[PDB]
Structure 1
Amino acid sequence: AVCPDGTRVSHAACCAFIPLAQDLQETIFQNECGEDAHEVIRLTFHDAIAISRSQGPKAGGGADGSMLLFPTVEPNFSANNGIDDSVNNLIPFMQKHNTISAADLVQFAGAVALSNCPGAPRLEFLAGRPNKTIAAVDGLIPEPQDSVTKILQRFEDAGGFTPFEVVSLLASHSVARANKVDQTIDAAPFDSTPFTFDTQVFLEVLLKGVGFPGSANNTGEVASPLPLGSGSDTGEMRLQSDFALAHDPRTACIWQGFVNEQAFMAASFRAAMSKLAVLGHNRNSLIDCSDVVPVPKPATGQPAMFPASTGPQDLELSCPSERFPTLTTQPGASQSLIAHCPDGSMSCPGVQFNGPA
């Protein structure tokens, strides 16, 4: 087909997503892998994972746009703390680009947000999900304090995800921060490069913890290897779940397998996301609109490296069957502060709309 802007697209139904991508970029992302982008990527997962094979259809419809359609229900469950901001930012687009369903909107927005992160893959995007569903039940969202067994069961019950696909999905923590785990601090990064879709998160979770970014008594949080922060540049935070998956016999070698393996990590993430994005639907009933997802920002191609103040001697390895790669260490006697803003500054508030959530 060919859209009203000369863009030759695969199917005419995909044309509507072009003006949406531009609107999302201009209004809330500003072509960067910042605050608003991170929040939308998180929403993609929270919307999709609320489904259960054992409990049946009444438990939730998966990637159905339920968070936007029933803003006063799910956003208020304990496990969805902080999701309100992304819901209120997306609702305005639902009302404007009214030919696109709330469900399609959520998945597409995530694909657009991710493309702003250097090193991220170009996600597959299928369209045609219904604009009608039910509000999901509480308890279907995994939490930081959950055990690996509980986490693995949840993903299996949601869509038959194997442990490999579960760890692959966690590559998203390479461009993630926390605002609710500790109420005394904001935007605590999970890795030293929160604006880069690289393999640092896999490396940094394997280092010995030496302190905490803020309080040391938070549910679902364990000691961090790079806790130093100053002003707006908050220190690195480490979640119990990420730590637990890095050391459990079932997932340890998978987790290590991604260290310094950029192409492998990105490809595996893309694959896992293809399954996640269609939970609650039959992919044979959705149109392929992948050619409408923006081309992702390229990375520099540099290898993973130990951040300043850490080295090979600080590793807590759990995979007995695989040799850990030889990586270099960045020079410096002390830990470098992790930048709060993608431009290096400490002042960069993302656009935020008020809404029902």
Structure 2
Amino acid sequence: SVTCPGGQSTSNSQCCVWFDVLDDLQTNFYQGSKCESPVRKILRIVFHDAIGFSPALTAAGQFGGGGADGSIIAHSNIELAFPANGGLTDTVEALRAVGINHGVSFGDLIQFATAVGMSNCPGSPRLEFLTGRSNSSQPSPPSLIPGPGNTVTAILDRMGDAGFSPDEVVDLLAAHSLASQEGLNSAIFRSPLDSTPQVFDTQFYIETLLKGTTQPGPSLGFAEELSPFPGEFRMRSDALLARDSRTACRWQSMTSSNEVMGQRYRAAMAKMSVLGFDRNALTDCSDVIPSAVSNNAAPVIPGGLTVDDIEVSCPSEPFPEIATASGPLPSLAPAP
């Protein structure tokens, strides 16, 4: 182990630079270690950056993309033109300057920012952080990012090609527990995807399974479905994934334990963090990531709804026993 200039101990000298980056991101990018829009955006970026990897394209004699190579920043001119990459400009620009001023690769920076961002959100696991990804990259081919109107088959197909099994697709989606939408229905800008957009918990999995009864906006936008209460937005792909036979059971098993959800997501994320790379070539700097405060709230079916309102879709196991909150129906405020 080594002791960096500032006095912090670490297992590798290549981790030292990150303590400075941590200080920078928390102060400025995160505006005081907060769990607001900046974290959710970075979470969109890390997914959109890494999934630009496709062994099948490579098989068809084409460039399949370099994965988590930081290409979304390096080639933002091309990638930010992608339909799926709307609303990310200001975030890409802010990160570009951080990577430049610290001499760290874009690929590594995006991964670091994700782990650090999540620590500011109660309930989040301590994500793994590897460093050593090259700073060079080619722009990602278009159409490698799954969209909200895609069919479950198409989604599982794209993710499978990248290396994720259906279970892992459900695990990765835990990120929607700290999410809102800004571009699917602008009339309800920043409507949350679950009742706790600042808490990494199982509410997302529970709420997407409740019967859709409400139209939160003046109209139902593109790829929008009815949600269980005012202020909450339900994306079509989440709705289908929650109920599809190929993913239903994993989804349901994610409702009762925050601990299990965290562990699974963390594992899935570690796998996604190295798409396009060989982890044996990277250096482990996980010890730099701070812990997130604990979330002790129990998973609950909100607003007087009961298990009778849950559209059970898994045939092999009963819906688990969880708490029920008293009414009335909540009305979600926009995410910050």
Normalising by structure 2, report the TM-score: 0.95
Instruction: Quote the Cα distance in structure 1 between the aligned partners of 2:200 and 2:153.
Output: 27
Contact 1:174 1:191 in 2 (8 A): yes
Instruction: Quote the Cα distance in structure 1 between the aligned partners of 2:202 and 2:319.
Output: 14
| Superimposed CA distance per residue, residues 87-134 of structure 1 (whole angstroms, 9 cap, x where no aligned partner) | 122112122112x11110111001110111111110111100001010
Among candidates 182, 185, 208, match of residue 182 of structure 1? 185
| Superimposed CA distance per residue, residues 317-357 of structure 1 (whole angstroms, 9 cap, x where no aligned partner) | 11122111233322233x2232446xxxxxx6xxxxxxxxx
Matches within 5 A, 1:23-172: 23-29=24-30, 30-56=32-58, 58-98=63-103, 100-158=104-162, 160-172=163-175
- Look up the match of 1:273: 269
Instruction: Quote the Cα distance in structure 2 between the aligned partners of 1:76 and 1:213.
Output: 29
Q: Alpha-carbon deviation of 1:285? A: 0.5
Among candidates 204, 208, 214, match of residue 207 of structure 2? 204
Contact 2:126 2:289 in 1 (8 A): yes
Normalising by structure 1, report the TM-score: 0.90
| Superimposed CA distance per residue, residues 11-67 of structure 1 (whole angstroms, 9 cap, x where no aligned partner) | 101000001011101102121211111111111111111110011272311001111
* 2:244 matches 1:248: yes
Moved over 3 A (4+): none
CA RMSD of aligned residues (A): 1.3
- Look up the match of 1:6: 7
Contact 2:122 2:292 in 1 (8 A): yes
Q: Alpha-carbon deviation of 1:156? A: 1.2
* 2:20 matches 1:19: yes
> Between the two proteins, what is the percent identity of the paired residues?
43
Unaligned runs of 5+ in 1: 229-234, 342-347, 349-357
Q: Report the secondary structure of 1:210's partner residue.
A: coil
Among candidates 301, 305, 321, match of residue 300 of structure 2? 305
Contact 1:182 1:215 in 2 (8 A): no
- Look up the match of 1:338: 332
Unaligned runs of 5+ in 2: none
Contact 1:168 1:272 in 2 (8 A): yes
* The structure with more helix, counted as a fraction of residues: 2
- Look up the match of 1:354: none
Q: Alpha-carbon deviation of 1:221? A: 1.2
Instruction: Quote the Cα distance in structure 1 between the aligned partners of 2:214 and 2:288.
Output: 44
Amino acid at match of 1:313: D
